[PDB]
């Protein structure tokens, strides 16, 4: 039930392009491995894991029907990091840096969504 829209193509070709290459992207390109990291409480706190590797694949595979779905996955990723981790943890500053770039890129997105 997926579509290609102008906003989803923008989120793929402009927003994700910028975030995927960023120096702080590496913890977020793939799901958190709570076993490997030794975080037995991770999945007790985070009930909807999300990462940029999953988002990127959904964009590539036209999984989304509408840009809001992709925006929601980005918000889940960032909030998940802020909820699980502590405010002074490095990972949170990395996530906030990525969120700043996300927001700056989204600010130039077409304001109206249309299928292509």
């Amino acid at each position: 039930p997926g579509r290609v829209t102008n906003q989803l193509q923008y989120l793929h070709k402009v927003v994700m392009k910028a975030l995927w290459k960023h120096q702080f992207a590496w913890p977020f390109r793939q799901p958190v491995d709570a076993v490997k990291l030794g975080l037995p409480d991770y999945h007790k706190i985070i009930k909807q894991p999300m990462d940029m590797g999953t988002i990127k694949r959904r964009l590539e595979n036209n999984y989304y029907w509408a840009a809001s779905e992709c925006m929601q996955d980005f918000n889940t990723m960032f909030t998940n990091c802020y909820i699980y981790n502590k405010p002074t943890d490095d990972i949170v500053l990395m996530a906030q840096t990525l969120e700043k770039i996300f927001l700056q890129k989204v600010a130039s997105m077409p304001q109206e969504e249309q299928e292509l």
């Binding site: 120096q23 390109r29 981790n85 490095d90 990395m94």
Partner: peptide, 15 residues
Amino acid sequence: WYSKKYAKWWTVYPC
């Protein structure tokens, strides 16, 4: 493995 608290110690995915 990496530390969430000290994540910036690592420049790339350490696995």
